[PDB]
Design a binder for these strands. Structure first.
Lengths: 112, 21, 82, 158, 93, 159, 421, 162
RNA sequence: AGGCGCGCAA
RNA sequence: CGGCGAGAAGGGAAGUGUGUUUCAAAGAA
RNA sequence: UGGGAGCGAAGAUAAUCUAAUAUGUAGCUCCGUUCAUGGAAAUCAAAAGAGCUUUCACUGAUUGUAUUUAUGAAACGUGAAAAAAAAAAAA
């Protein structure tokens, strides 16, 4: 287990391409904003990158308990809803989860 | 990000209006 | 076993699945009556003429022949021997 | 309107309209030239009897275009080679009772049917006919019977 | 599938092997007896229990320990007056 | 024909592939479910033709073994993925046969209009408003529309 | 029958002038047309529409709504002549709408293959009149004209030249190609034809003012002196604008009474305001021009027309499209360009007074090429730039627009001193 | 092809039913045919279910043809039909429709949809369209003609590109 | 019916 | 030289875009 | 009765152990096996189609469930077996 105190910094592209780089900085510079000019493949040249603010665990045991008893189904229903709202299960050009279930009611294929 | 696109929705409504009265 | 590295048709798009309306590029920019009436009556009286034979319907004057016809019909008739 | 609608015509509709023009003696070289282009474009989707009717109607109306009739002849030959034997016989019987027709096409269908009947050998070959004895009676009426066909028919009977 | 008024909708069309291999401890809550297709009990046949009778349910914990328990019906002893029988009927269950 | 000669046994459809871009010596017309670009180019270089006819599973079964059907079924229309595939194959250079949807017809009309005037505006700006030349050799409106639609669909490709 | 009322429509049309004797008859014809629905042909519908277009009142309004309803149904069966006839009719009766106009124009574009010479002339006239710039349609029609030049009479050639020049569709080479054919019948052409050719040549800025002077001579001879009273307002404005633009003052004293009568006449035009600006400014500032005063009500109406033009510019979205890229250009040239400002006695769409640079867009609505305005702005000290509409349309991306505007701005910046040679 | 795959029936039911064709069988060639049976084929598209003269009967199909009265083409009538292997003859279309019971409430048809399907198959083998469908004369807004929205991820990517 | 294999050269 | 049409439940299921497909929770050896 | 119904374990595998497997097995009680089970679609599927129920082979140890051990005659479908629907309004 690492004992380093260095802070993790994620530099997001200012071109709004969602591209990012990752590094670390000293704890003395917590309030110092890092900025760099680095290549962005989304736009195919060097743009600015800025550090962002970056404001329980669903484990295998909890997943098994939920799927065998269904007493806290909302936790995973929320993830399904997020995927549905984002654009999963659109029937086309999707090898992973083209459909919510097959005709018989199974959630296949298994992609994770 | 609107969904479904308003132009698609309006076009579908206009296509349905004459057939469905 | 071996394929060319570049597939030049990847990225093919079928149609316009666009966010916005399909607006046409033009949309951003948007005495003689005696001659007109005489021409309209001259055209109207023609439609009402009794035809001698059923095949004489298109026996009209050159000026009133559609231009494209005036350019292409001679070639068609020179090639369509009877 | 007819010239506009021609590209969406069916083959039997091509034949029907040309036959109507031939019946009514409505010949107009401009319209016929316009129509024949669509006809040639749709030629590979025209049945044999309909092509016969189209050629006959055009000849009656007075069209004398060698290139057009050569395209028609090539299409006729290909369709003859493509037809199976039973439908070949059916098209023969259809062609024998047409308003307008082409005698060369009639001769071609007759020759193809004769060749197919003489090619028959065994019961499997004769099985291609819906009614072998009705076909025999037709060939008797037309004086088309042959020794090879009779031998194949006897094997089929066995 | 058919017989949507009875239990077993997703078993009806899965196969013979699954039907024979079905594990009862998979069912946590009790199923109504009529929809399950369970034999009436002697107590039910000696009383008027309608849709209720002895049943079973499974206990499952986060440790995944399973346990099946028999559960009795909620029955009362009540008296009725019957004109057709011309008599009071004490202590019907 | 391939199945019956046992050149290849058909379960889902035959796909042609060429090796090392080697040439093909014979002029042939062949119908298949798929084909690689090298195969298509080699076939067409000598005057050949590659055809793709849309077929559902049942349609392919009836096409390979019609003798098992008392009543042959009518071919069904493709879905969005198969329409995309068929138009991509047509762009590749194959002949394509399927029932085209009404929405696709209408949108093709609109796209053709728009791209035609994009070309018209470009030509007018360059100063080529008048189509000088013999009309017997100039391209037709349909051919121009086909060219523009193909380029629009190939926008994000390497051509 | 159903033709008796068509013949009676034409009979009443015979009273087109002084439309008072036939008013009750029109009141009855409107009811007859309404009650005889689904009893005429498409061309009989066109005839009724044409007959009632040249009248006003309740019967005309009812016929207006009736033809508006029936035209949508009967459009597919019409021929280009009647498509154009109904287009003009509805434009007259003010019942036209954008959707129906688009339907008519699309029908004509599809039916291009059936266009005759008269149909070509009419469609081009309508497109020029309404400033309907459809590149593909215009290219096809111009190709027809330039392939069948010999099939057009000189009058039709003059009309086509005027329409295309107004649409900004011809170059100098095309104008020369058309004028080569038009040259043989200039004397035979009537007054209106000569006026149309003169306006077209003025807009084109023909490199040979010789032909312009010749056309002026023919127009003057054909229309006589002002005392004769044969001059029409459009012809007078055309002659005056051509004279002022080409600087023919030393040879056109005869234009002085023409200007006098033009200014004496009242102002009701809707699209000649730009040319009236140009002649006013040339007369006021160019001393060599004929010296005629400008009534204060003329000046005030011209100012009000300018203000309406500014309102239309604000309504138009093209202005914002250019504004965004001009703002983007500030990163390179820091131009503080502003909208609808004053550069001399003119109103300018885009102005930056710090660098004295004015930019405008060449709309088809203007009958002038703005050459007089550019010359006057240069004299006053303002660097004037005009963007050609077709060249602006050609550009598809903001990068291309930026390069185009950089090329436009390169010239003046050297003169202003913001760039080094 | 576009017109053919969209035609709407217009003839009268009686006139249509007068056009019945008795099935006629012819064997395929020993090898392979040079093309597909093209009775109702336009541009390579089968636009109508076609009776197949060139069927290769197996044991089950031959049993059905030989034993079941519904396949006895020499006693076949469009108005009186047997269903599958039935020996009862049912009135068409009177037995295909739901009826009211002694309480006046709706009751399922005496022939179920499954047997109506067999009657339809008999019609098709006799070369007759199924005229007894509820909306035979009405055009349909086919499922394949609906305009599809592509994957939502495409629109999200376009929004992000903007 | 189905299963495996089906040159990477020319 | 085929014409506005022969009583089809207002309910179940199918992606939630149902315009479309299919069935009738109701019967015998 | 390795068929059907009810209740329902541990030794064994997981190299301990839990789930899962063993197994819905053993014991116990009850049916009593083609004159039987079951069953004539508010079924399955795709925008083409199949046609109650049942048996065999393939699809395939595939897609699945279990996520250290293993389990899985899956669904649609294909080739065969058998073939059936319903005497019957009274007399």
């Amino acid at each position: 287990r690492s004992r380093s105190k260095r802070l993790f910094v994620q530099l997001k592209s200012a071109a709004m391409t969602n591209f990012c780089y990752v590094t670390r900085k000293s704890p003395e510079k917590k309030n110092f904003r890092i900025a760099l000019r680095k290549y962005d493949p989304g736009v195919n040249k060097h743009v600015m990158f800025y550090e962002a603010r970056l404001p329980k665990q669903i484990t295998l045991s909890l997943q098994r308990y939920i799927r065998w008893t269904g007493k806290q189904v909302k936790l995973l229903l929320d993830k399904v809803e997020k995927a549905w709202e984002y654009g999963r299960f659109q029937k086309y050009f999707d090898n992973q989860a083209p459909l919510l279930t097959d005709r018989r009611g199974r959630a296949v294929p298994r992609y994770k | 990000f609107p969904w479904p696109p308003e132009h698609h929705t309006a076009r579908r409504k206009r296509r349905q209006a004459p057939g469905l009265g | 076993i071996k394929v060319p590295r570049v597939d030049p048709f990847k990225g093919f798009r079928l149609a316009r699945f666009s966010l916005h309306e399909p607006t046409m590029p033009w949309e951003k920019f948007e005495d003689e009556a005696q001659a007109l009436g005489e021409e309209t009556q001259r055209l109207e009286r023609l439609d009402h003429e009794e035809l001698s034979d059923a095949a004489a319907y298109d026996d009209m004057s050159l000026t009133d022949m559609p231009l494209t016809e005036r350019m292409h019909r001679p070639k068609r008739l020179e090639n369509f021997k009877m | 309107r007819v010239l506009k609608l021609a590209p969406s015509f069916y083959s039997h509709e091509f034949a029907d309209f040309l036959c109507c023009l031939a019946r009514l003696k409505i010949a107009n070289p401009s319209f016929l030239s316009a129509f024949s282009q669509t006809l040639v474009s749709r030629l590979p989707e025209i049945a044999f009897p309909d092509a016969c009717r189209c050629v006959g109607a055009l000849r009656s109306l007075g069209v004398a275009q060698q290139s057009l009739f050569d395209l028609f002849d090539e299409r006729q030959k290909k369709e003859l080679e493509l037809l199976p034997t039973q439908l070949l016989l059916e098209d023969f019987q259809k062609v024998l009772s047409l308003e307008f027709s082409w005698q060369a096409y009639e001769n071609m269908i007759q020759e193809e049917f004769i060749k197919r009947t003489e090619a028959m050998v065994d019961d499997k070959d004769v099985d291609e006919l819906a009614d072998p004895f009705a076909c025999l009676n037709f060939m008797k009426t037309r004086n088309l019977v042959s020794d090879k066909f009779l031998l194949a028919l006897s094997k089929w009977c066995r | 599938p058919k017989n949507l008024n009875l239990w077993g909708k997703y078993l009806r069309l899965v196969g013979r092997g699954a039907r024979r291999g079905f594990k009862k401890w998979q069912v946590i809550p009790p199923i109504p007896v009529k929809a399950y297709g369970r034999e009436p009990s002697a107590a039910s046949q000696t009383g008027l229990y309608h849709d209720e009778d002895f049943n079973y349910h499974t206990k499952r914990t986060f440790s995944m320990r399973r346990t099946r328990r028999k559960i009795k019906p909620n029955v009362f002893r009540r008296t009725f007056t019957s004109s057709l029988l011309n008599v009071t009927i004490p202590n019907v269950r | 024909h391939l199945n019956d000669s046992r050149c290849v046994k058909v379960k889902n459809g035959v796909s042609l592939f060429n090796v090392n871009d080697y040439p093909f010596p014979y002029k042939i017309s062949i119908e298949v479910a798929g084909a690689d670009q090298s195969s298509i180019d080699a076939i067409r270089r000598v005057g050949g033709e590659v055809i793709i006819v849309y077929r559902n599973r049942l349609n392919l079964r009836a096409h390979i073994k019609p003798y098992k059907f008392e009543v042959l079924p009518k071919t069904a229309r493709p879905n969005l993925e198969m329409v995309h595939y068929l138009e991509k194959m047509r762009a590749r250079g194959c002949v394509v046969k399927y029932v085209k949807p009404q929405w696709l017809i209408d949108e093709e009309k609109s796209l053709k209009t728009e791209l035609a005037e994009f070309e018209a505006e470009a030509l007018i700006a360059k100063g080529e408003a008048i189509e000088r030349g013999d009309p017997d050799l100039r391209e037709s409106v349909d051919d121009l529309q086909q060219r523009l639609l193909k380029r629009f669909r190939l926008r994000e490709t390497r051509a | 029958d159903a033709r008796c009322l068509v013949d009676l429509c034409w009979a009443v049309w015979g009273f087109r002038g002084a439309p008072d004797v036939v008013e009750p008859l029109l009141n009855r014809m409107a009811s007859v047309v309404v009650r005889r629905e689904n009893a005429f042909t498409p061309k009989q519908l066109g005839t009724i529409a044409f007959t009632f277009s040249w009248f006003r009142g309740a019967p005309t309004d009812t016929v207006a709504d009736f033809v508006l309803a029936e035209c949508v149904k009967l459009l597919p069966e019409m021929e280009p002549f009647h498509v154009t006839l109904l287009f003009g009719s509805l434009r007259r009766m003010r019942c036209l709408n954008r959707d129906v106009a688009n339907l008519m124009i699309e029908k004509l574009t599809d039916d291009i293959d059936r266009f005759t010479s008269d149909d070509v002339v009419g469609v081009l006239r309508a497109l020029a009149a309404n400033s309907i710039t459809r590149g593909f349609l215009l290219r096809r029609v111009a190709t027809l004209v330039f392939d069948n030049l010999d099939s057009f009479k000189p009058k039709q050639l003059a009309s086509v030249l005027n329409s295309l020049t107004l649409l900004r569709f011809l170059t100098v080479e095309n104008g020369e190609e058309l004028f080569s054919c038009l040259s043989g019948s200039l004397s035979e052409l009537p007054a209106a034809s000569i006026a149309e050719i003169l306006e077209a040549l003025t807009i084109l800025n023909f490199p040979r003012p010789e032909v312009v002077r010749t056309c002026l001579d023919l127009l003057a001879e054909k229309n006589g002196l002002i005392s004769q009273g044969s001059w029409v307002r459009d012809h007078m404005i055309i002659a005056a604008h051509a004279v002022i633009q080409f600087q023919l003052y030393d040879k056109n004293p005869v234009v002085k009474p023409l200007l006098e009568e033009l200014f004496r006449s009242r102002v009701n035009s809707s699209r000649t305001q730009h040319r009236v600006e140009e002649v006013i400014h040339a007369l006021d500032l160019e001393k060599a021009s004929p010296r005629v005063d400008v009534p204060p009500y003329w000046r005030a109406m011209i100012d009000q027309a300018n203000r309406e033009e500014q309102a239309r510019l604000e309504h138009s979205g093209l202005q914002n499209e250019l504004t965004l890229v001009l703002d983007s250009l500030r990163g390179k040239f820091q131009l503080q360009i502003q909208k609808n400002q004053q550069a001399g006695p003119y109103s300018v769409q885009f102005l930056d007074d710090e660098t004295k640079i004015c930019i405008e867009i060449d709309y088809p609505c203007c009958r002038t090429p703005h050459i007089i305005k550019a010359r006057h702005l240069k004299q006053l000290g303002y660097h004037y730039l005009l963007v050609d509409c077709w060249q602006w349309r050609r550009l598809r991306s903001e990068a291309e627009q930026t390069v185009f505007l950089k090329q436009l701005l390169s010239g003046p910046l050297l003169e202003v001193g913001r760039l080094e040679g | 092809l576009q017109r053919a795959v969209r035609e709407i029936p217009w003839k009268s039911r009686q006139d249509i039913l007068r056009e019945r064709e008795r099935p006629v069988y012819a064997a395929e060639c020993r090898g392979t045919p040079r093309r597909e049976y093209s009775k109702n084929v336009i541009d390579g598209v089968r636009v109508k279910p076609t009776f197949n003269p060139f069927v290769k009967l197996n044991k089950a199909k031959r049993y059905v043809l030989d034993n079941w009265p519904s396949r006895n083409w020499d006693d076949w009538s469009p108005y009186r039909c047997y269903v599958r292997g039935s020996r009862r003859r049912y009135n068409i279309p009177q037995d295909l429709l739901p009826y009211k019971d002694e309480l006046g409430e709706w009751h399922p048809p005496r022939l179920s949809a499954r047997y109506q399907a067999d009657v339809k198959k008999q019609y098709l083998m006799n070369n007759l369209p199924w005229v007894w469908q509820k909306d035979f004369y009405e055009g349909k807004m086919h499922f394949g003609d609906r305009e599809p929205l592509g994957p939502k991820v495409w629109y999200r990517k376009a929004f992000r590109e903007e």
